[PDB]
């Protein structure tokens, strides 16, 4: 609450100093706990002021004027703290109104490759530190993977679409500045099977609950039994889920076999008793005949004949008592048996109606991670799960493009300029680009630094789209190999009227096979106008890229009619299909932690490259080639906020380097 809220909303602990701060304020962190708590209030209070209104540049003069002693006291420390938050982009980022118009005495020159959000965030920061910044993008528009489709009042995002909570999200600040309209998302999502009828409710829950367990089970499998390598090869979340399901199937059988083997041991005991009772009956039979024969010797008989009746009479009432007690412990075993033959264990682990609803839960996972589960690291797929924001996820009714468009305002963005070669040396860098329209036309940009927001997809392509001169060193390229670049596609269906449940944000279709859990597995409304997004995920995303839009929209209306009626669902006015893996300025959707990657590759991807020296025996040059992007930020990968933070970061790194540290 208050000073502490601002720390948390700035992704920082109010309690204690970060590593970034230890680096810049070693005097303090190594010094007494008293001076640390001062530092910490100034930092938190300075942040609070920024956030409390982030449409106005917050100056040094301003912050000092709204501290009060004892913190107010040391006006150097306050100016250091203010200038630290300024670089590292914790305050005065996004769209502020500058109070002092930045001077035209621009110092140092930087080429930024790509009008990413990462690109634009950095561009704006470097500009506000008074550097000379030019952005070079291949596309005919800014935004990159923040692509929004307009056509009349119809507006739908084919790229980033969701603000994944405002609780510590830097986009929380950008939304106040840009006045983009955020609508909430009710995550409740009814399923509907292939046949087109809502999975009933008690099913929905049995399967979800079982999904949620099966995951937790891979986590136990990973951390507890250390099942993370198998035949010299890293285990996938996929492999682990199969090995868990195969074992839950194997326990169902072990369980039946244990139960029938227990019935059989009872029947083999009832048998040992019947064999005994049948030998006593046929022996009693014999003895009774002997008693009647002896009993029928009419008296007056002597005493041995009298003893013979009296004896046999006993010997029989004895064997009759044995067989009465064997026949009671018979009637116990026939109940023990009507008990067991009435209380079986479970027949199956999952039916095929079940194993298919489970497959829709695996598509939702394949959709979120933008890749088949066969590719996700078992040890590391959920590494960023610590830094997830707070509050409900939100769509942008407005269309997310409204952000990068607003970030672009005031930058030297050269559009339709495909970078082809980045050359970096002791004395500086040349970027060589071409006009994407007429490609013979060649452009040369000279600069002190190159900032590369090139997507991991592009960085991966062979033969390469962009050549580095000299080559990126193994440690960098190896990381680009190890790291995963995924895929996820949307289908935009604009109708004339709403024929779905307006108070339901999303709903799912369950495919008939595992092999296509992903094919049009889920449907959103923007709900503003009558639009339905349909997501393609998993192995499916990749394959549906070679299938005409008419066919995809066919499979779509097919499904929708299944669920809502035939005369209910009209033809769409307008349809679009994303084909991200095909798009050569993307080569896919966003990063993922592949098996045999870690989070540590995200860190390699951010470390800048320092050229060798030009004259042998010459001071160690400065770093020249820097990297930002969704794929460079360990704790917030594959997002917009992660991009935006990665840019804010490389801006600091480059100013620290070329304008000397604050």
């Amino acid at each position: 609450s208050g000073v502490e809220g601002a720390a948390f909303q700035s992704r920082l602990p109010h309690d204690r100093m970060t590593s970034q701060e230890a680096a810049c304020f070693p005097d303090i962190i190594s010094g007494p706990q008293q001076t640390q708590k001062v530092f910490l209030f100034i930092r938190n209070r300075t942040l609070q002021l920024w956030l409390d209104n982030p449409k106005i540049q917050l100056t040094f003069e301003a912050t000092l004027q709204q501290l009060e002693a004892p913190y107010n006291s040391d006006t150097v420390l306050v100016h250091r703290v203010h200038s630290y938050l300024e670089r590292h982009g914790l305050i005065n980022f996004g769209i502020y109104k500058r109070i002092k118009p930045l001077p035209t005495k621009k110092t140092g020159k930087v080429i930024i490759i790509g009008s990413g959000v990462s690109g634009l965030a950095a561009a704006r920061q470097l500009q506000s530190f008074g550097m000379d910044v030019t952005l070079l993008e291949a596309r005919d528009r800014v935004g990159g993977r923040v692509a929004t489709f307009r056509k009349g009042n119809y507006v739908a995002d084919l790229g980033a679409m969701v603000v994944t909570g405002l609780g510590g999200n830097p986009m929380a600040v950008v939304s106040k500045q840009v006045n983009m309209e955020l609508a909430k998302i009710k995550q409740k999502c009814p399923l509907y099977e292939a046949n087109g009828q809502a999975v009933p409710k008690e099913k929905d829950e049995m399967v979800e609950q079982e999904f949620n367990r099966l995951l937790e089970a891979t986590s136990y499998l990973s951390h507890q039994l250390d099942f993370n390598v198998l035949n010299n090869k890293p285990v996938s979340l996929g492999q682990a889920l199969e090995v868990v399901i195969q074992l839950q199937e194997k326990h169902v059988k072990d369980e039946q076999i244990e139960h029938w083997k227990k019935i059989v041991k009872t029947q083999e005991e009832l048998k040992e008793l019947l064999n005994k009772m049948v030998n006593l009956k046929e022996k009693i039979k014999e003895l009774h005949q002997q008693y009647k024969e002896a009993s029928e010797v009419k008296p007056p008989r002597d005493i041995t004949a009298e003893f013979l009746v009296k004896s046999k009479h006993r010997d029989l009432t004895a064997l009759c008592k044995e067989y009465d007690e064997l026949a009671e412990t018979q009637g116990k075993l026939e109940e023990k048996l009507q008990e067991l033959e009435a209380n079986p264990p479970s027949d199956v682990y999952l039916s095929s109606r079940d194993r298919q609803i489970l497959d829709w839960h695996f598509a939702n996972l394949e959709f979120a991670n933008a890749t088949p589960l066969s590719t996700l690291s078992l040890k590391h797929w959920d590494q960023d799960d610590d830094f997830e924001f707070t509050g409900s996820h939100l769509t942008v009714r407005n269309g997310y493009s409204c952000v990068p468009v607003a970030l672009a305002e005031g930058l030297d963005i050269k559009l339709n300029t495909a970078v082809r070669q980045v050359r970096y040396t002791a004395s500086g860098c040349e970027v060589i680009a071409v006009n994407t329209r007429s490609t013979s036309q060649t452009f040369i940009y000279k600069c002190d630094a190159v900032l590369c927001t090139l997507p991991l997809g592009v960085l991966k392509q062979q033969p390469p789209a962009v050549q580095f001169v000299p080559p990126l060193p193994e440690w960098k390229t190896s990381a680009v190999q190890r790291m995963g670049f995924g895929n996820l596609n949307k289908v935009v269906l604009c109708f004339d009227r709403v024929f779905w449940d307006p108070s339901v944000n999303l709903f799912g279709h369950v495919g008939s096979t595992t092999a296509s859990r992903g094919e049009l597995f889920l449907f959103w409304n923007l709900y503003k106008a009558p639009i339905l997004l349909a997501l393609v995920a998993g192995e499916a995303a990749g394959i549906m890229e070679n299938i005409s839009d008419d066919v995809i929209v066919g499979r779509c209306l097919a499904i929708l009619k299944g669920i809502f009626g035939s005369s209910a669902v009209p033809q769409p006015k307008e349809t679009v299909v994303s084909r991200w893996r095909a798009d050569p300025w993307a080569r896919g959707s966003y990063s993922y932690v592949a098996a045999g990657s870690s989070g540590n590759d995200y860190d390699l991807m951010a470390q800048p490259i320092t050229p060798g020296p030009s004259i042998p025996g010459a001071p160690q040059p400065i770093p020249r080639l820097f990297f930002a992007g969704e794929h460079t930020i360990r704790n917030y990968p594959a997002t917009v906020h992660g991009a935006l933070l990665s840019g804010l970061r490389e801006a600091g790194r480059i100013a620290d380097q070329f304008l000397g540290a604050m």
Binding site: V162, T164, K186, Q187, K188, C189, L191, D204, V207, E208, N212, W360, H361, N364, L365, A368, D382, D385, E388, H393, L506, G508
Partner: peptide, 7 residues
Amino acid sequence: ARXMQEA
């Protein structure tokens, strides 16, 4: 379902 795994 609930709509989880979109952390």
